[PDB]
Design a protein around this nucleic acid. Sequence first.
DNA 1: ACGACAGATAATTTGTCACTGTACACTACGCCTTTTGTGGAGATGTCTAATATCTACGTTTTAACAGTGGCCTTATTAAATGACTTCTCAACCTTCAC
Length: 602
Amino acid sequence: SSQITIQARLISFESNRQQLWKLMADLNTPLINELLCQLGQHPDFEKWQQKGKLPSTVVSQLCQPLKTDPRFAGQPSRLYMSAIHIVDYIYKSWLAIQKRLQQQLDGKTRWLEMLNSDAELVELSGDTLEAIRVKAAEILAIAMSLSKTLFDAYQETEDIKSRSAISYLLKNGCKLTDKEEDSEKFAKRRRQVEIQIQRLTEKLISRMPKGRDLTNAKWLETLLTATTTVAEDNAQAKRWQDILLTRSSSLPFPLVFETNEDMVWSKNQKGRLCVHFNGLSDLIFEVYCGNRQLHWFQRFLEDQQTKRKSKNQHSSGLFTLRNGHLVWLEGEGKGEPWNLHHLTLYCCVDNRLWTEEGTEIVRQEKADEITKFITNMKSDTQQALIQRKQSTLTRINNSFERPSQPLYQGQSHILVGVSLGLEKPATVAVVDAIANKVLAYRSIKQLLGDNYELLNRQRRQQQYLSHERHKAQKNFSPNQFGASELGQHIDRLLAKAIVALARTYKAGSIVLPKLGDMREVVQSEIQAIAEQKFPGYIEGQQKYAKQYRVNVHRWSYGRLIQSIQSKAAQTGIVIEEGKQPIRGSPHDKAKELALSAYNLRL
DNA sequence: ACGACAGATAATTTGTCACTGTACACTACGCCTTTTGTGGAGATGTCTAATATCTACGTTTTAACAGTGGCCTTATTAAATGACTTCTCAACCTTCAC
């Protein structure tokens, strides 16, 4: 996770900002909207959902006739390209989501079929429980990936004895068990799977990507319709209401510049770094950044100047800058939108390209990938692709003469396990795995140190700000706020503390748990309990454990994992994934998480 | 011869009267002992109703709270917020413009 974003304000005189706003809002965003509409109507759309993959070129092909439609014709080539990238990534995202959800629904539907109680397994096997227990002992002795191997063994073995023995073996977590099945805990575990299947089935009714209408013409024409026309029935009037409540999108889609050299850097005579974008060189924007990021923007000019001095004998494949996003940030107050909103550039950089040693890491990664490509790839334009790839492979050998910082060296036998929990967001154990000894624990309080008071602040603000929103909603007041930025701050403080401890003990890796989807587990567990406690009373079921379900939906385990992954990559510490045990305290969970990831190395 | 007539005669008792021996001399029912049935205290032994004491019999009363039972409507779409997921993160070459 070595890619990170740095940002700066872009400043320019009003006519440059107005011209860019009108390009984005009047042409580029309407084009994106049109591409999303046409792409969702394509005759292959239903087979793209089955593959879960979009064709590499279909957005580019749809955009070609639109580039000369009077609605969209006025744009530079890179703005059409940006619109293509926006639309292509949206569907690459959405088709990947739907594909995995469909696989989850199919997987659990098979499990629901093969989850049979011992009373059902007796009939469906025709064998006594001891007989299927012995047959499961044989099938386990052959399947010795074990879970998948049993799922593979189940499907084509139509022999109901072995098929039931696999069912019995899978019910217990791929192992034998002597103890009797508690019939109500089984019936609950069956009911959980039905709820999960239903909730997956409902999630697969997701909407197609909606776009951003900045005119909101549909709202005003619906208002005129609903006020002067009789609704033909309740369903038309409901559709009218649903439109009238829909909020207006203020801001256009950002521009995306996937060619780092489509940002051209310079220093003006007042000494400020400046940038202009390919196709819009007349609009000079001035960089206004914090000094904590200035060294990156200075590097972008130095990388640009280095390759010009070498007459392009360097490769921009090793430019520290990777891509840019050009974004309008919503301004407070009033004005024309190019005056109200603040133009902001977000630059992706790869942190390894800062140093010379890290650049050598990237160079070999580039060289191996391109040598693979050239070997596997072998038309005129496809031969031109090979020649560009071969030019890259030649030019990445030329050095940028970057700062030298020796790479981190961590001991392979020292690991940090990080236990994640709802009550204690992180707990760490430094384990010496060949010694099987814990070198150090730290609690959440020791990780946060002097910041530990922020953790009670978060809980207190989450309560307070929720209640103030609840009160504000009843007044239709816009003053609705929350603690997300404090929560993000805490997760970043924890990430830095964990990695600093890992560096201090020379740990080779940080071990993080494969939590899965905690929210759908908790939500289906609690619903199965509540349906027994409040039969036929839906509101009673939804009130049951409401605050626990809320707490689990706020638990930011993904954001914390992501923050740890970024900080570890910036110091070259390996991340490993392990299985967090359910037994024990957060300290013991962290220790056994660490040691299991060591033993799982094969 | 004996004894047998009437009457003598030696007893026998009746009655006188001088003499003398004696008590009157105040001087026993009184002193003393033992038994003994009746009687007067006065230490001591006899043995109860009863007015408690002295706990328990257990029996009510409380409140605490535990368990049963009724009710609670459910859907769509938009918005805000908090999150999750996915995708992306070229580069050399050509052409026309001073």
